[PDB]
Amino acid sequence: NLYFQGMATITLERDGLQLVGTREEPFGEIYDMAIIFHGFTANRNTSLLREIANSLRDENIASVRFDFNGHGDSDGKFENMTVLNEIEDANAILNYVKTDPHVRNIYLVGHAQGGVVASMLAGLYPDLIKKVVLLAPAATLKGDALEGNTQGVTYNPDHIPDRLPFKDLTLGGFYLRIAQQLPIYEVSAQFTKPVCLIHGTDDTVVSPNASKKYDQIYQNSTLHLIEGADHCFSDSYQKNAVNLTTDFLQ
Amino acid sequence: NLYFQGMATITLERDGLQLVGTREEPFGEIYDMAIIFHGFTANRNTSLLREIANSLRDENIASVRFDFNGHGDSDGKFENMTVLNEIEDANAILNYVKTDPHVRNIYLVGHAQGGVVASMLAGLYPDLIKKVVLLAPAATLKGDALEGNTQGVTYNPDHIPDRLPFKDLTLGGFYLRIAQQLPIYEVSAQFTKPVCLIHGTDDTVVSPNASKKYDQIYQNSTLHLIEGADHCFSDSYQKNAVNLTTDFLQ
Ligand SMILES: CCOC(=O)/C=C/c1ccc(O)c(OC)c1
Ligand SMILES: CCOC(=O)/C=C/c1ccc(O)c(OC)c1
Ligand SMILES: [Cl-]
Ligand SMILES: [Cl-]
Ligand SMILES: [Cl-]
Ligand SMILES: [Cl-]
Ligand SMILES: [Cl-]
Ligand SMILES: [Cl-]
Ligand SMILES: [Cl-]
Ligand SMILES: [Cl-]
Ligand SMILES: [Cl-]
Ligand SMILES: [Cl-]
Ligand SMILES: [Cl-]
Ligand SMILES: [Cl-]
Ligand SMILES: [Cl-]
Ligand SMILES: [Cl-]
Ligand SMILES: [Cl-]
Ligand SMILES: [Cl-]
Ligand SMILES: [Cl-]
Ligand SMILES: [Cl-]
Ligand SMILES: [Cl-]
Ligand SMILES: [Cl-]
Ligand SMILES: [Cl-]
Ligand SMILES: [Cl-]
Ligand SMILES: [Cl-]
Ligand SMILES: [Cl-]
Ligand SMILES: [Cl-]
Ligand SMILES: [Cl-]
Ligand SMILES: [Cl-]
Ligand SMILES: [Cl-]
Ligand SMILES: [Cl-]
Ligand SMILES: [Cl-]
Ligand SMILES: [Cl-]
Ligand SMILES: [Cl-]
Ligand SMILES: [Cl-]
Ligand SMILES: [Cl-]
Ligand SMILES: [Cl-]
Ligand SMILES: [Cl-]
Ligand SMILES: [Cl-]
Ligand code: NA
Ligand code: NA
Ligand code: NA
Ligand code: NA
Ligand code: NA
Ligand code: NA
Ligand code: NA
Ligand code: NA
Ligand code: NA
Ligand code: NA
Ligand code: NA
Ligand code: NA
Ligand code: NA
Ligand code: NA
Ligand code: NA
Ligand code: NA
Ligand code: NA
Ligand code: NA
Ligand code: NA
Ligand code: NA
Ligand code: NA
Ligand code: NA
Ligand code: NA
Ligand code: NA
Ligand code: NA
Ligand code: NA
Ligand code: NA
Ligand code: NA
Ligand code: NA
Ligand code: NA
Ligand code: NA
Ligand code: NA
Ligand code: NA
Ligand code: NA
Ligand code: NA
Ligand code: NA
Ligand code: NA
Ligand code: NA
Ligand code: NA
Ligand code: NA
Ligand code: NA
Ligand code: NA
Ligand code: NA
Ligand code: NA
Ligand code: NA
Ligand code: NA
Ligand code: NA
Ligand code: NA
Ligand code: NA
Ligand code: NA
Ligand code: NA
Ligand code: NA
Ligand code: NA
Ligand code: NA
Ligand code: NA
Ligand code: NA
Ligand code: NA
Ligand code: NA
Ligand code: NA
Ligand code: NA
Ligand code: NA
Ligand code: NA
Ligand code: NA
Ligand code: NA
Ligand code: NA
Ligand code: NA
Ligand code: NA
Ligand code: NA
Ligand code: NA
Ligand code: NA
Ligand code: NA
Ligand code: NA
Ligand code: NA
Ligand code: NA
Ligand code: NA
Ligand code: NA
Ligand code: NA
Ligand code: NA
Ligand code: NA
Ligand code: NA
Ligand code: NA
Ligand code: NA
Ligand code: NA
Ligand code: NA
């Protein structure tokens, strides 16, 4: 605001869970604000999300970025997270943002699974959200769950197990049962305001076809395929994601 | 079981919320079990649900019935309940039931909004649930939310308010935004095992057309229209609901 600029820690609650977040506060009495959503197994402080927040703050766009339930510093077991309860987390964060008297326009920025959360939340609040940026939005998590193959971990899609060992973690069977029937595009398509879609051509985690499909469903979208970029826009690809996001929101 | 028959209190947790429930335990080493779901603003102990549980227990069918979040003895604010987080409550109760070593078949019985919870949960677990009974399933809550008229309380469906005073309570705007885009029939229709639909012809809360539509979408359903019955199968209508439910599950 006019008096404080910088980082602050924010905590919110959703159901019985504390959600821990970082606010970047820019200069100015009134400013726009982006809510930034991390991906599956990630956290609010990956290099990509910090550099997005930093870049927006440099153009006097505020941001908040929270750890989802089951991730980072927020409460809850990873095994109990689903895309649906992350959308509930997102709604709780939006409640916080939308009542801040400094905030003019609200934007959503989501990476990967956080892009599915962002796109679905904007479709539930198409009257309130003003712009959306999706970075490698993981809408393919649905098709993967229907196929019975989630990032190389295979199971019966017709009879999903109670829980699925997944790397060092345990993924809930309910995550997968929800994933299979998530109306990702149906809900997302209700947002008719501007959307920026950014996807790396060498993403091996989420096919760029996800973003090509969002670009088809959305009334007002712009698609950016980043030649050679991977799923996280790592290293020399990162500024492609940061620049496009910043430019779109200013 | 062979040694204890009667009532017990059960508590489960979902996210950070305690859910309080009543188990009716029948005689027998192995038995089927019904999970019974109450409606909007109701609780696990309405006369209808107690008499269902009692009648099933008399045919040695066990049951559990929990207060949803925001209701009865369970945790959470009513203002923060949605149909979606009740489905999350239902999944937590199913986790409990499906790991009980006495339970043979699992049935779902849901009244009104609890019927939407039941029908959607069965569509997420069509491999596990064996039979469903819906009593006046409130699938019209979706159409009502799209219309902007929820049990006589009117609002703009295009711009749902943050919260909606509703009788002595406060209904969350997010309940309504979720309601509008709930894929009730899409998810429910995935359950192809037997369903019993029971609806009163004089229900003024949820049109009998809801049950007529479920009867169309389901592969294996039986529809019972109870001439003169109201929304709760009150008083002299109650045994119609209790008898049909019991008969169907035995
Ligand atoms: C951390 C950033 O990346 C992620 O969010 C990717 C998520 C996503 C991809 C495909 C899947 O089948 C899936 O199922 C769990 C998840
Ligand atoms: C207690 C048993 O009855 C209920 O569950 C009925 C619920 C239902 C009916 C129509 C609605 O528009 C609605 O929106 C909140 C809720
Ligand atoms: Cl100020
Ligand atoms: Cl000043
Ligand atoms: Cl700082
Ligand atoms: Cl705080
Ligand atoms: Cl606490
Ligand atoms: Cl400005
Ligand atoms: Cl930094
Ligand atoms: Cl840092
Ligand atoms: Cl972490
Ligand atoms: Cl945690
Ligand atoms: Cl697709
Ligand atoms: Cl299994
Ligand atoms: Cl949904
Ligand atoms: Cl689809
Ligand atoms: Cl469709
Ligand atoms: Cl969207
Ligand atoms: Cl490509
Ligand atoms: Cl990853
Ligand atoms: Cl960068
Ligand atoms: Cl026993
Ligand atoms: Cl004995
Ligand atoms: Cl007793
Ligand atoms: Cl207990
Ligand atoms: Cl507690
Ligand atoms: Cl038996
Ligand atoms: Cl009693
Ligand atoms: Cl009693
Ligand atoms: Cl009560
Ligand atoms: Cl309560
Ligand atoms: Cl309908
Ligand atoms: Cl309003
Ligand atoms: Cl419909
Ligand atoms: Cl459809
Ligand atoms: Cl169903
Ligand atoms: Cl009728
Ligand atoms: Cl009522
Ligand atoms: Cl009775
Ligand atoms: Na500072
Ligand atoms: Na800070
Ligand atoms: Na603090
Ligand atoms: Na709370
Ligand atoms: Na808390
Ligand atoms: Na600043
Ligand atoms: Na200013
Ligand atoms: Na990440
Ligand atoms: Na972790
Ligand atoms: Na933690
Ligand atoms: Na925490
Ligand atoms: Na969790
Ligand atoms: Na925890
Ligand atoms: Na866990
Ligand atoms: Na403006
Ligand atoms: Na797909
Ligand atoms: Na899909
Ligand atoms: Na399929
Ligand atoms: Na498979
Ligand atoms: Na992968
Ligand atoms: Na595997
Ligand atoms: Na399954
Ligand atoms: Na497993
Ligand atoms: Na399915
Ligand atoms: Na669906
Ligand atoms: Na769903
Ligand atoms: Na979809
Ligand atoms: Na753009
Ligand atoms: Na990659
Ligand atoms: Na893949
Ligand atoms: Na395209
Ligand atoms: Na293209
Ligand atoms: Na488009
Ligand atoms: Na344009
Ligand atoms: Na393009
Ligand atoms: Na294009
Ligand atoms: Na372009
Ligand atoms: Na490029
Ligand atoms: Na490359
Ligand atoms: Na690189
Ligand atoms: Na940068
Ligand atoms: Na630069
Ligand atoms: Na007893
Ligand atoms: Na008891
Ligand atoms: Na006890
Ligand atoms: Na828990
Ligand atoms: Na608790
Ligand atoms: Na008994
Ligand atoms: Na026995
Ligand atoms: Na009731
Ligand atoms: Na109450
Ligand atoms: Na209470
Ligand atoms: Na409680
Ligand atoms: Na609640
Ligand atoms: Na409480
Ligand atoms: Na309340
Ligand atoms: Na059997
Ligand atoms: Na309707
Ligand atoms: Na409908
Ligand atoms: Na409509
Ligand atoms: Na209206
Ligand atoms: Na009414
Ligand atoms: Na009114
Ligand atoms: Na609305
Ligand atoms: Na209001
Ligand atoms: Na809509
Ligand atoms: Na939908
Ligand atoms: Na939804
Ligand atoms: Na529907
Ligand atoms: Na029947
Ligand atoms: Na009635
Ligand atoms: Na009505
Ligand atoms: Na019919
Ligand atoms: Na009929
Ligand atoms: Na049928
Ligand atoms: Na038959
Ligand atoms: Na009939
Ligand atoms: Na019929
Ligand atoms: Na009949
Ligand atoms: Na009748
Ligand atoms: Na009557
Ligand atoms: Na009567
Ligand atoms: Na009776
Ligand atoms: Na009798």
Author numbering:
A (entry chain A), B (entry chain A): -5 to 244
Task: Quote what the paper states about this structure.
We previously showed that LJ0536, a cinnamoyl esterase purified from L. johnsonii N6.2, is active towards a variety of substrates including short acyl chain aliphatic esters and phenolic esters. The structure showed a canonical α/β fold characteristic of esterases, and the enzyme is dimeric. Two classical serine esterase motifs (GlyXSerXGly) can be recognized from the amino acid sequence, and the structure revealed that the catalytic triad of the enzyme is formed by Ser106, His225, and Asp197, while the other motif is non-functional. The structure revealed a prominent inserted α/β subdomain of 54 amino acids, from which multiple contacts to the aromatic acyl groups of the substrates are made.
The Ser106Ala-ethyl ferulate complex crystallized in two forms (Form I and Form II with a dimer and a single chain in the asymmetric units, respectively). The two ethyl ferulate crystal forms are nearly identical in structure. We focused our analysis on Form II due to better occupancy of the ligand in the active site. The electron density for the C2 atom of ethyl ferulate has missing electron density in our structure, which is consistent with this atom being part of the leaving group after hydrolysis. One oxygen atom of the carbonyl group that forms the ester interacts directly with the oxyanion hole formed by the backbone nitrogen atoms of Phe34 and Gln107, while the other oxygen interacts with His225 and an ordered water molecule present in the caffeic and ferulic acid structures (the ethoxy group of ethyl ferulate occupies the space of this water molecule). Due to these interactions, ethyl ferulate rotates slightly and positions the ester bond perpendicular to Ser106 at a distance of 2.73 Å. The ester bond is strained from planarity (bond angle of 116°), suggesting that the hydrolytic mechanism involves a tetrahedral enzyme-ester intermediate, typical of esterases. We observed a water molecule 3.3 Å from the non-carbonyl oxygen of the ester bond of ethyl ferulate towards the solvent-exposed face of the pocket. It is possible that this corresponds to the water molecule that is the target for deprotonation by His225 to hydrolyze the tetrahedral intermediate between the ligand and Ser106, regenerating the enzyme and releasing the product. The opposite end of the ligands, on the far side of the ester moiety, such as the ethoxyl group of ethyl ferulate, rests on a more solvent-exposed area of the groove and has few interactions with the protein.
